[PDB]
Each structure stands twice: as C-alpha cells, then as structure tokens.
C-alpha cells in the first residue's frame, strides 16, 4: 500500500453499501476465514485508500453468526469458533445487529 493517504471522511450507509458491493465484485472476501488481525488489516487498507476512519466494522458477539453494527455493510461472519466472511444483501434492508443486540446503539 504505497499510495499517499486520502483525507478522512465518514462511513455512511451509502458508502457502506457501495463498498460491500465493490468488495463482492473484486472477490476475495467471500469465503475468507476471519481473524481479528485480518479484520484490522482490511480496516487499515480501507482507511488508507478510502479515508473511512477504521471504527465502522464491528460485529455482534458470538456465538453463531456475527452481524455488522454499521447498517449498510453487507458482510457477516459465519461459523465453520471458526468464522468466514459472508455477503448478505439482506443486511442493507434489515438492520439485524440493532435487532439482535440493541444495546450497541445507545
């Protein structure tokens, strides 16, 4: 990653959706095993290249499937704990993480 740093900007619903689809199309994230280290690396890359501050990619606690806190991010983490990144367009319409774990929005 040797391209000069772009300015900061907020992750919006729209940016999160566009970003989800961009990564789905580029491919590589779907069916990738999740380490916290891998998550952090992805966040830093997106931060360096796109300027989104790396505080948007938080998921719901285990066990089972892990749901994104940022509405519009269409990736969740799927067991088999061993997690994989998995695209789900439903997350752009239903804010699952706010449903299952409302305690992160107060």
């Amino acid at each position: 990653p040797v391209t000069p740093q772009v300015p900061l900007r907020p992750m919006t619903y729209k940016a999160a959706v566009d970003l989800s689809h961009f990564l789905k199309e580029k491919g590589g994230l779907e069916g990738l095993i999740h380490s916290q280290r891998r998550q952090d690396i992805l966040d830093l890359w997106i931060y360096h290249t796109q300027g989104y501050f790396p505080d948007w990619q938080n998921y719901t606690p285990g066990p089972g499937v892990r749901y994104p806190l940022t509405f519009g991010w269409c990736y969740k983490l799927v067991p088999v704990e061993v997690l994989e990144w998995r695209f789900d367009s439903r997350l752009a319409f239903h804010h699952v993480a706010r449903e299952l774990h409302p305690e992160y929005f107060k």
Partner: protein, 57 residues
C-alpha cells in the same frame, strides 16, 4: 481557481472520480470538507476527489 492531479487515483465507488496524474479539474464544491466535488476537464465527468491529491495551477 483551477487544479491539476499530482498522483493517479483509482476510485472504488461510483461517487468518486478516478483520475491520472496530469489531469485537470474544475472545483464544484469545497464546503463539505477535504473531499471535493470536481469536474474532469478531460472527460467532463463529475465526482468526488481527495483534495490533497491536487494543486493549484
């Protein structure tokens, strides 16, 4: 008040403007912070660009 690209920039999302070093821009908006709405004088296409990637002429 016209600007020129100093680096290449490949955009990921359609709201952003991809450009090459040595491309020219009309700045349409500078009020919303450090990402500027600009128009490529080479393609005419509008979009957002990182302000630190351009410099006055």
């Amino acid at each position: 008040t016209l600007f020129v690209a100093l680096y290449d920039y490949e955009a990921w999302t359609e709201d952003d403007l991809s450009f090459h070093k040595g491309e020219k821009f009309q700045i349409l908006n500078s009020s919303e912070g450090d990402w500027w709405e600009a128009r490529s004088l080479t393609t005419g296409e509008t979009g957002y660009i990182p302000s630190n990637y351009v410099a006055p002429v």
